[PDB]
Amino acid sequence: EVLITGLRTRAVNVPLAYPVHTAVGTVGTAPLVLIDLATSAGVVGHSYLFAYTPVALKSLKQLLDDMAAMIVNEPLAPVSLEAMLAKRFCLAGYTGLIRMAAAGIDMAAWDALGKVHETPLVKLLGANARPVQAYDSHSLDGVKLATERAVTAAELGFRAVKTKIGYPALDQDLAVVRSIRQAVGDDFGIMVDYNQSLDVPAAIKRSQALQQEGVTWIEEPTLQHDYEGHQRIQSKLNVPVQMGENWLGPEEMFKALSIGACRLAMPNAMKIGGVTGWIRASALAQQFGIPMSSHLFQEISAHLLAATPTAHWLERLDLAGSVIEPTLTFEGGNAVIPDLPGVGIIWREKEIGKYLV
Amino acid sequence: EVLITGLRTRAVNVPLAYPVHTAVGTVGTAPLVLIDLATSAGVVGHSYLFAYTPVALKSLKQLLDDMAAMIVNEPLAPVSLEAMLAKRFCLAGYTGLIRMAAAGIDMAAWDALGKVHETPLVKLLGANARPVQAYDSHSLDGVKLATERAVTAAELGFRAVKTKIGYPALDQDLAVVRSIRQAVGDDFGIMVDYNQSLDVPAAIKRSQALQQEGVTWIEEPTLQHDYEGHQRIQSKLNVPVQMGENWLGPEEMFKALSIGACRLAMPNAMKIGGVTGWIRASALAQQFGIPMSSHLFQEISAHLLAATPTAHWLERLDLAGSVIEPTLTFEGGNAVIPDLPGVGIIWREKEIGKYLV
Amino acid sequence: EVLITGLRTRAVNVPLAYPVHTAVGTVGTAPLVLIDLATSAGVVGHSYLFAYTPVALKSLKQLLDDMAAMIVNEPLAPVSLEAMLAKRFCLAGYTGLIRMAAAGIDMAAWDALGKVHETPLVKLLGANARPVQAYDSHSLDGVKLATERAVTAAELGFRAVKTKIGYPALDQDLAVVRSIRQAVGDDFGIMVDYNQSLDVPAAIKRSQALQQEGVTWIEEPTLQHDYEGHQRIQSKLNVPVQMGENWLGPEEMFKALSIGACRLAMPNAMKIGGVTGWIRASALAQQFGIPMSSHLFQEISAHLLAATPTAHWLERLDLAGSVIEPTLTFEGGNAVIPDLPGVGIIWREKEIGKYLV
Amino acid sequence: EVLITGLRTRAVNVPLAYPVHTAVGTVGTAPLVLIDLATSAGVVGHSYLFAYTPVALKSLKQLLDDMAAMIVNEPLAPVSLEAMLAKRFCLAGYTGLIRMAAAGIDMAAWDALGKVHETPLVKLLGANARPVQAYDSHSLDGVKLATERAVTAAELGFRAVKTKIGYPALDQDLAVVRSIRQAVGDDFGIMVDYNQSLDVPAAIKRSQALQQEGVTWIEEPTLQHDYEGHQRIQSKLNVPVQMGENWLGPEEMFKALSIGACRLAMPNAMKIGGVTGWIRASALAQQFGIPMSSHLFQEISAHLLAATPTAHWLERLDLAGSVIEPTLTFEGGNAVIPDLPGVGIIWREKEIGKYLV
Numbered sequence A, B, C, D: 001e002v003l004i005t006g007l008r009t010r011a012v013n014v015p016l017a018y019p020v021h022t023a024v025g026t027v028g029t030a031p032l033v034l035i036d037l038a039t040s041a042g043v044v045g046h047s048y049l050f051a052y053t054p055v056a057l058k059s060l061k062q063l064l065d066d067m068a069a070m071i072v073n074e075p076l077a078p079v080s081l082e083a084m085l086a087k088r089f090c091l092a093g094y095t096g097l098i099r100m101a102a103a104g105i106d107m108a109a110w111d112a113l114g115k116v117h118e119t120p121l122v123k124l125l126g127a128n129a130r131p132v133q134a135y136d137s138h139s140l141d142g143v144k145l146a147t148e149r150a151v152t153a154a155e156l157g158f159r160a161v162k163t164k165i166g167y168p169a170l171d172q173d174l175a176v177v178r179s180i181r182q183a184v185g186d187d188f189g190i191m192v193d194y195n196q197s198l199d200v201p202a203a204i205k206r207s208q209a210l211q212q213e214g215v216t217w218i219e220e221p222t223l224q225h226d227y228e229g230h231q232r233i234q235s236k237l238n239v240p241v242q243m244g245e246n247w248l249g250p251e252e253m254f255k256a257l258s259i260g261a262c263r264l265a266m267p268n269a270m271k272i273g274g275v276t277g278w279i280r281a282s283a284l285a286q287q288f289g290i291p292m293s294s295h296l297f298q299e300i301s302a303h304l305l306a307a308t309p310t311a312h313w314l315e316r317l318d319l320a321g322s323v324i325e326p327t328l329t330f331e332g333g334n335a336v337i338p339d340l341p342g343v344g345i346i347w348r349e350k351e352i353g354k355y356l357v
């Protein structure tokens, strides 16, 4: 009855604020692909994609433009849609860019299915809107700016910030961490992110030191695909090893969890397979006794997490704010889901035009 | 001293012959991306990429065009190059399309490094050119055509063909297999490919039946990423489970081998990471006691396999023949490496122009 | 096209400097076998072998003299050569002295293949020359001399020395370690080597104490072949257990890594199988997330490590300096690969004659 | 009180009879090193070593000549001696040629310790002389000669022969096996030896076929050091996988047994560490529920096996017969230990002189 009637994509390069100086590389602007999925019902669904690097921007768009044919005239059934894409790419590799594109479609699809029903996504999922404690996500900003950015966080009501470490010397890592703690006090969270920049032995040395300082969690210490490696690091700690931003599909998640690679997880809405993949990852975490947090996509992650049995933390890191309405809000360090059908994504057309690639 | 000075790409849609009717989907023409990598030495390296589906053709090209910047002015050092790309994409995901593109670059790089030295690739790798038994690769062609295509194979000196099964009924699978055997006799190889089209239990039922018929190997019975699944199937057989065409990187290989997912392997030159990744996969197979065969890219695979300690079979499946010279040859069902520097890839410019996308 | 035309060997007993008083036994002079491998191309390849003890000197030479027949008239293809030797000794045992001799041949072969191409080895391997942090390797020298030898190290720009411990009493071990630290400060590396001189329980007691003192790594605590044992020791530590100097072939490496016997590795160019074996060990370390350092053969190790994805530390321990040119250099505690084709080994004929056995 | 006063070695190249055409390579004459170990007691101990290949003959001798110094003036205490050699070579590698030489010394030492006591070795070991069923060991002799050689065996009272297979085709393997069976009947043993000439998958195919024919055991199907590999093969069979001729030390044995690599074992007196190592391997087999047979050295193996709790089969393969007295005898396919002190090795001085290298 409800058919997908079209797919429109726009590739922009949006302004951020600070610029995710990461534990390995850094980011000035943000490359995104905005997605409009048209339906026979007179409702348009929305989503966006993050390209990490501009190198992949035109590619990711071109890929979606070419997939539009596969999905038009198909029924608006995300679960079915997803299955169909998985069979169509089984040879090329239903992962990477292909999977990210599929995820963008799923997200829009679910958004449109939410509007069809004049219901907020979380509600459609069968749950009640609840706030979610979130943490302010910073970068590899050095002692001073890291410290400055945390006082502001807390000033805005945040109860934890996340900072990027992995300086040439463990000593620097610590420096940064201590300055923030002094600035904010013992009743505050400090999550650190090594951005997969260390080897296993080094991660053990550094993590132990930090453990002492009292970090909330140590995220992506080594190469992301090295599950076993992560297990080895974790095995030497009390503090939780955090991971999962790079899991392409619930299938990669399953693998990592199967070996006890981590104590916490934080799937990425795009990489995990959109709404459809999330639901699945959430069931996994549950069975595995893994508190599940989010990575980017605060808009949809807010709804998603409220339907997650082991929901943990939402990550505040506004990639898309310059081109969308400020529907998602934060009340006392807790994200509040807007009371709008679907995900609550409303475009800022005039701005969009400013950043078109 | 030797620098990369440029990257040119052309996307064509080449004519094949028969059309890889596969155990799940089928292929009429072939979408490729041809790569020219220019050097300060006045030598151009070559490679090509297979896109499986035209959906990904423009995308894959656009991706390479955008990566050209990363590699220009870099030294012509494939091993170093590769490392550098791996750090640059650690966030986006050094797999999928990104990895395939990286592999295409590596292949060209190694080709150019071979010309720089006026030496054939295999030679540069430290080995001697030797023929490699190959098998003629067919598709899901039905009883009649499968049978017709095998008599010809053997007529051309082949000692084994590979066919695609996975018909709605096990009975059909068998039919196809028996007709070929009758046509060719007991002293002939028959490799079957299910193209990841079955569940685990069904693969056990079907594989056992075939086991009886005497197949050389059962390839990709279930979903490719389901390593454990493959282990379960294998555990119930005597005949070898074959896999590895979808392993994106030696890192995915390692995982599968670690659980004893298969008895044989056949990495894909593109997906495994080009020459650089191959060398690594080959060391793995060795330690693991896994006879290693190839998947597509007969041109480079010929050289590659001769430097493989556990070299098994080369797969004949000419994707690129319409746009390149017939340097690779087959003598009595054995592939013969041409005595040309590099890989031996020479373009057919006039033809290329015919298929430009 | 390029054939091996001859094999010449000379056995010398070279002067050292200090004399590797080891955590079990000690060394005054150095017994080596120098290898010249002649080719149809008018290029001679070089390598040398270390005999550890003079007991094995004449034996090792005699063994190479007798193998010369096997390799003459063979093509200059190290990878092929190596395979051929492995089949020829499968009965006698392709390990021990036999393997060491094979490794010496491989090394020369690769050196000659580098000259054939007027290219530095590392370059031929596909990588870029880069410096490698190295550490000055000392012996079981006692408190005073150990301390004296470190001040000089650092004076020469080294950032870490390695010392031999394993005194009758843990107290002595510590003494030595503390004196060096005082002498050099907290920003300096101290690697310790027990030379396989302890039992498992004792290694646990001693390693824990040292862990406190802050050693960089604990190397070969127990009998080298006792992998499991090493795993037990490691399991009780935070500090890395280092091993691999005695691994005869990548096959022994694989075994040790398979059980998690260590956190770091340091293969020996000779024992691991020359260039050919190295390439393989390096792929293993990679997959296993094991930072790989070297053992002896600083000349070739320098090139080797630059092509190692998980390259760690180069060990400075000049066995051969009295009979070769000072091509390898150290700039600020980093080894610099000479810009000479092959490995860069140039003999000092007049000196050689002084030490001929 | 009893000291070792000297070590004499002679390297001969002895005539055989048939010539161990092996499942990979073949042998015309036999290269041995005969050992005389002098004592303060006026008793000379004896042993011999097998060099597999003449390539290693001069080397092995030279090695023993150089070790003589280490052992002279030492007490005639094999157990202590052995320990001492193990510490002295811990750096060079107490395996390979070095270990073989050590084993030759141990064997002589024990022989001399037997003469000192005017007691037969087995007796000194604490056991009673008993016959041991043995099997006649043949080579890769083809259908006809294999068949001829078995009729004779049985004619001489043997109840089982061992033949070498591994022909280019499984069909040949079978041919050979069937002809012998026809020739001898169902109440006869047929042990087959693949000489490590197959890959894992192929070994599974071939072994299963043979299993059908009814072989006594399948020996060294794949590369000897590939324990895991052997475990995989064994796991697919009912018939016993036999191995252990290449285990250098009880330490290599332990490893293989630990993973269930085989159902039977057959250590080599030389490679396992002489008498001293045997005693140890025998305790291992016992605990592991592994029937233990021998490899070469029928003279000492006869005594050894009678002191083995899980003693199985003795292998008849007379390497040394041309230079020693016919003390060891066979009565009805059972080896009979001579009633002479020590091992019973008496040289044939006049003959020795004929084969001196």
Ligand SMILES: C[C@@](O)(C(=O)O)c1ccccc1
Pocket: A020, A022, A137, A164, A193, A195, A245, A295, A296, A317, B091
């Ligand atoms: C640091 C990071 O891994 C995170 O935790 O959010 C991150 C990665 C990529 C883009 C933005 C942020």
Ligand SMILES: C[C@@](O)(C(=O)O)c1ccccc1
Pocket: A091, B020, B022, B137, B164, B193, B195, B245, B295, B296, B317
């Ligand atoms: C059937 C196949 O998996 C193979 O074995 O080659 C194949 C897959 C994709 C394209 C061509 C061929």
Ligand SMILES: C[C@@](O)(C(=O)O)c1ccccc1
Pocket: C020, C022, C137, C164, C193, C195, C245, C295, C296, C317, D091
């Ligand atoms: C101490 C040592 O094991 C090392 O680490 O180099 C060593 C062993 C043998 C010879 C020289 C040095």
Ligand SMILES: C[C@@](O)(C(=O)O)c1ccccc1
Pocket: C091, D020, D022, D137, D164, D193, D195, D245, D295, D296, D317
């Ligand atoms: C075939 C063999 O492995 C055996 O079983 O004895 C053998 C190996 C080496 C020399 C002689 C015999």
Ligand SMILES: [Mg+2]
Pocket: A193, A195, A219, A220, A245
């Ligand atoms: Mg992160």
Ligand SMILES: [Mg+2]
Pocket: B193, B195, B219, B220, B245
């Ligand atoms: Mg296939």
Ligand SMILES: [Mg+2]
Pocket: C193, C195, C219, C220, C245
């Ligand atoms: Mg050491």
Ligand SMILES: [Mg+2]
Pocket: D193, D195, D219, D220, D245
């Ligand atoms: Mg044998």
